[PDB]
Write a protein that holds these residues in place. Structure first.
Motif, PDB file in Angstrom:
ATOM      1  N   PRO A 210      20.038  37.058 -55.590  1.00 44.38           N
ATOM      2  CA  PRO A 210      18.678  36.783 -55.115  1.00 44.38           C
ATOM      3  C   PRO A 210      18.158  37.905 -54.230  1.00 44.38           C
ATOM      4  O   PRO A 210      18.900  38.504 -53.449  1.00 44.38           O
ATOM      5  N   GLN A 211      16.864  38.184 -54.361  1.00 43.30           N
ATOM      6  CA  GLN A 211      16.191  39.197 -53.559  1.00 43.30           C
ATOM      7  C   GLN A 211      15.299  38.513 -52.533  1.00 43.30           C
ATOM      8  O   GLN A 211      14.446  37.695 -52.892  1.00 43.30           O
ATOM      9  N   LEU A 212      15.499  38.847 -51.262  1.00 40.36           N
ATOM     10  CA  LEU A 212      14.742  38.206 -50.195  1.00 40.36           C
ATOM     11  C   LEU A 212      13.256  38.509 -50.342  1.00 40.36           C
ATOM     12  O   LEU A 212      12.862  39.655 -50.575  1.00 40.36           O
ATOM     13  N   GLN A 213      12.432  37.468 -50.206  1.00 40.19           N
ATOM     14  CA  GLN A 213      10.986  37.598 -50.305  1.00 40.19           C
ATOM     15  C   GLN A 213      10.273  37.492 -48.967  1.00 40.19           C
ATOM     16  O   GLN A 213       9.168  38.026 -48.834  1.00 40.19           O
ATOM     17  N   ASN A 214      10.867  36.823 -47.981  1.00 37.75           N
ATOM     18  CA  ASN A 214      10.245  36.676 -46.674  1.00 37.75           C
ATOM     19  C   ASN A 214      11.298  36.223 -45.677  1.00 37.75           C
ATOM     20  O   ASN A 214      12.156  35.401 -46.010  1.00 37.75           O
ATOM     21  N   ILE A 215      11.226  36.762 -44.463  1.00 38.96           N
ATOM     22  CA  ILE A 215      12.157  36.434 -43.391  1.00 38.96           C
ATOM     23  C   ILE A 215      11.351  36.095 -42.148  1.00 38.96           C
ATOM     24  O   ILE A 215      10.424  36.829 -41.786  1.00 38.96           O
ATOM     25  N   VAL A 216      11.703  34.991 -41.496  1.00 36.38           N
ATOM     26  CA  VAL A 216      11.043  34.540 -40.277  1.00 36.38           C
ATOM     27  C   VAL A 216      12.018  34.725 -39.124  1.00 36.38           C
ATOM     28  O   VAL A 216      13.107  34.138 -39.122  1.00 36.38           O
ATOM     29  N   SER A 217      11.627  35.536 -38.144  1.00 36.04           N
ATOM     30  CA  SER A 217      12.454  35.820 -36.980  1.00 36.04           C
ATOM     31  C   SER A 217      11.634  35.626 -35.714  1.00 36.04           C
ATOM     32  O   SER A 217      10.475  36.047 -35.644  1.00 36.04           O
ATOM     33  N   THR A 218      12.242  34.988 -34.720  1.00 31.52           N
ATOM     34  CA  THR A 218      11.604  34.724 -33.439  1.00 31.52           C
ATOM     35  C   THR A 218      12.322  35.488 -32.335  1.00 31.52           C
ATOM     36  O   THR A 218      13.554  35.492 -32.258  1.00 31.52           O
ATOM     37  N   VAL A 219      11.537  36.138 -31.481  1.00 30.56           N
ATOM     38  CA  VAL A 219      12.070  36.917 -30.370  1.00 30.56           C
ATOM     39  C   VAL A 219      11.267  36.584 -29.123  1.00 30.56           C
ATOM     40  O   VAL A 219      10.044  36.435 -29.178  1.00 30.56           O
ATOM     41  N   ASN A 220      11.963  36.471 -27.995  1.00 32.64           N
ATOM     42  CA  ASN A 220      11.342  36.169 -26.713  1.00 32.64           C
ATOM     43  C   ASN A 220      11.113  37.463 -25.946  1.00 32.64           C
ATOM     44  O   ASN A 220      12.050  38.242 -25.739  1.00 32.64           O
ATOM     45  N   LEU A 221       9.868  37.688 -25.528  1.00 28.42           N
ATOM     46  CA  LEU A 221       9.532  38.875 -24.754  1.00 28.42           C
ATOM     47  C   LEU A 221       9.882  38.734 -23.278  1.00 28.42           C
ATOM     48  O   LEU A 221       9.880  39.741 -22.561  1.00 28.42           O
ATOM     49  N   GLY A 222      10.179  37.524 -22.811  1.00 32.20           N
ATOM     50  CA  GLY A 222      10.619  37.337 -21.444  1.00 32.20           C
ATOM     51  C   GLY A 222       9.542  37.492 -20.396  1.00 32.20           C
ATOM     52  O   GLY A 222       9.860  37.721 -19.228  1.00 32.20           O
ATOM     53  N   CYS A 223       8.271  37.375 -20.776  1.00 33.38           N
ATOM     54  CA  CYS A 223       7.182  37.512 -19.819  1.00 33.38           C
ATOM     55  C   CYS A 223       5.955  36.797 -20.359  1.00 33.38           C
ATOM     56  O   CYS A 223       5.641  36.914 -21.547  1.00 33.38           O
ATOM     57  N   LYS A 224       5.267  36.062 -19.488  1.00 30.69           N
ATOM     58  CA  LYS A 224       4.040  35.390 -19.890  1.00 30.69           C
ATOM     59  C   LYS A 224       2.959  36.417 -20.202  1.00 30.69           C
ATOM     60  O   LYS A 224       2.838  37.442 -19.526  1.00 30.69           O
ATOM     61  N   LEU A 225       2.170  36.135 -21.234  1.00 28.02           N
ATOM     62  CA  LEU A 225       1.147  37.049 -21.718  1.00 28.02           C
ATOM     63  C   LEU A 225      -0.219  36.381 -21.679  1.00 28.02           C
ATOM     64  O   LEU A 225      -0.334  35.156 -21.791  1.00 28.02           O
ATOM     65  N   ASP A 226      -1.255  37.201 -21.519  1.00 24.87           N
ATOM     66  CA  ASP A 226      -2.642  36.741 -21.554  1.00 24.87           C
ATOM     67  C   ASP A 226      -3.157  36.950 -22.973  1.00 24.87           C
ATOM     68  O   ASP A 226      -3.371  38.084 -23.408  1.00 24.87           O
ATOM     69  N   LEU A 227      -3.352  35.847 -23.697  1.00 22.01           N
ATOM     70  CA  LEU A 227      -3.750  35.944 -25.098  1.00 22.01           C
ATOM     71  C   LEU A 227      -5.115  36.603 -25.243  1.00 22.01           C
ATOM     72  O   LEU A 227      -5.318  37.438 -26.132  1.00 22.01           O
ATOM     73  N   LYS A 228      -6.066  36.243 -24.378  1.00 19.76           N
ATOM     74  CA  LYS A 228      -7.409  36.804 -24.487  1.00 19.76           C
ATOM     75  C   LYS A 228      -7.390  38.316 -24.310  1.00 19.76           C
ATOM     76  O   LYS A 228      -8.058  39.046 -25.053  1.00 19.76           O
ATOM     77  N   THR A 229      -6.628  38.808 -23.331  1.00 21.72           N
ATOM     78  CA  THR A 229      -6.559  40.248 -23.104  1.00 21.72           C
ATOM     79  C   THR A 229      -5.960  40.965 -24.306  1.00 21.72           C
ATOM     80  O   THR A 229      -6.436  42.039 -24.698  1.00 21.72           O
ATOM     81  N   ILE A 230      -4.915  40.391 -24.904  1.00 25.05           N
ATOM     82  CA  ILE A 230      -4.259  41.041 -26.034  1.00 25.05           C
ATOM     83  C   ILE A 230      -5.226  41.181 -27.202  1.00 25.05           C
ATOM     84  O   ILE A 230      -5.293  42.233 -27.849  1.00 25.05           O
ATOM     85  N   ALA A 231      -5.994  40.127 -27.488  1.00 19.85           N
ATOM     86  CA  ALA A 231      -6.916  40.175 -28.618  1.00 19.85           C
ATOM     87  C   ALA A 231      -7.949  41.279 -28.439  1.00 19.85           C
ATOM     88  O   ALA A 231      -8.280  41.992 -29.393  1.00 19.85           O
TER      89      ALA A 231
END
Length: 179
Positions: free
Chosen positions: A5-26
């Motif tokens: 089988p050939q992988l078609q999609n991989i879901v990986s989660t990583v923690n940045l360890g710091c709260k982020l401001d979503l509005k600023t990032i956008a």
DNA sequence: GCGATGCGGAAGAGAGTCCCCCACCCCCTTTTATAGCCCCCCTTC
């Protein structure tokens, strides 16, 4: 079996360890889109890895679309750097692969009606709901979508070994219902 | 002037033959393969 089988999609989660401001990032992120009414995360896309990542205010990020383990980690690191480049103390903590999606073809039609009869404990074939048979393997916790055309899709694997192991188990079973 | 009461008559029972608040879970979203099904718009004449 001769088929891997050939992988078609991989879901990986990583923690940045710091709260982020979503509005600023956008506002500053190149490809980020933030719609709090629709979703509470920030969706960002990077073309060269060809992956999409969701960023939450808690600092945890989910990376999807990677075709390999290396691509997922590399793509996740690139997203973290983009957030880090925005002035946040983003890190790469407890990076983990949550799901691996693989697809393959057995190169012969499959009699799904026969397969469900012999494996009713694991199989679930409902043409009304989905045209493909859903097989839940137990020894590896992998869910397989078997289709009459022969295409087989594997999902829910945490490591590439499960994807190959799951297919090795089901291939002899499919061979017994060849059409 | 100032109270107080027994009996007849009437009445009446009683027996016989809703709106709110507080857990807990699901879906919102993203990615991908698969395929039949079906909506919607387009096109044909």
């Amino acid at each position: 079996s001769g088929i891997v089988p050939q992988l078609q999609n991989i879901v990986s989660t990583v923690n940045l360890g710091c709260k982020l401001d979503l509005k600023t990032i956008a506002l500053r992120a190149r490809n980020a889109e933030y719609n709090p009414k629709r979703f509470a995360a920030v969706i960002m896309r990077i073309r060269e890895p060809r992956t999409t990542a969701l960023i939450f205010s808690s600092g945890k990020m989910v990376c999807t679309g990677a075709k390999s383990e290396e691509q997922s980690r590399l793509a996740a690191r690139k997203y973290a750097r983009v957030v880090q480049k925005l002035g946040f103390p983003a890190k790469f903590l407890d990076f983990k692969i949550q799901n691996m999606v693989g697809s393959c073809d057995v190169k012969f039609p499959i009699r799904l009606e026969g397969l469900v009869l012999t494996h009713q404990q694991f199989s679930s074939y409902e043409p009304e709901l989905f045209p493909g048979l859903i097989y839940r393997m137990i020894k590896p916790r992998i869910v397989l979508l078997i289709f009459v055309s022969g295409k087989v899709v594997l999902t829910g694997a945490k490591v590439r070994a499960e994807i190959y192991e799951a297919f090795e188990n089901i291939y002899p079973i499919l061979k017994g219902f060849r059409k």
